[PDB]
């Protein structure tokens, strides 16, 4: 299986987080191909993929809004190829806030429209994603065991 992991982190929590995931991920023998939002180019990304995993922190105060790299993707996610694909979603975010990681239901809703499969329901970690290191291990064995 190949898995394509796309993230976007401004504080690199998330970033952490794409990290743990892909070694999860690799030590399986999937082969995985990581890239950060910030230079990904959104048309046809998702080709020849058999797994997408996308990850975005939450910002904002009383507005949600996504993790800046990751704007412009989430904007062109049409381009994508996300139809009938295999995906789920990750990201950061602190409970205390309003909308936690609403950026995360974001992604899943479009990606829903779109057509894709939502193999396993977002991870949202609350807090510094290094002390939720086993709820990401976790998340990452549930998905491979829902392909
Ligand atoms: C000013 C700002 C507003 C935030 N807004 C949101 C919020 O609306 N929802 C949420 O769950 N987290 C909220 N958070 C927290 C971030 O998502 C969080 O600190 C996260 O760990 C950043 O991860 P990252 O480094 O990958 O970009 C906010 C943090 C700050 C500093």
């Known amino acids: 299986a190949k898995a394509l992991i796309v993230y976007g982190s401004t504080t690199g929590n998330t970033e952490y987080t794409a990290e743990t995931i ?23 990304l998702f080709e020849g993929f058999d797994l997408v995993l ?4 939450t910002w904002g105060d009383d507005s949600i809004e996504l993790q800046d790299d990751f704007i412009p993707l989430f904007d062109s996610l049409e381009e994508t190829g996300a139809q009938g694909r295999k995906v789920a979603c990750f990201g950061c975010g602190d409970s205390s806030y309003e909308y936690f ?18 193999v396993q329901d977002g991870l949202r970690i609350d807090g510094d994603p290094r002390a939720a290191r086993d709820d990401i291990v976790g998340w990452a064995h549930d998905v491979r065991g829902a392909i």
Do not use: H, Q, T
């Open 101 to 118: 990681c609403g950026a995360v239901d974001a992604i899943e809703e479009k990606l829903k429209n779109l057509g894709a499969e939502i």
């Open 54 to 57: 996308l990850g975005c922190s």
């Open 22 to 44: 892909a070694r999860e991920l690799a030590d399986a023998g999937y082969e995985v191909d990581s890239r950060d939002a910030a230079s990904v180019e959104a048309g046809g």
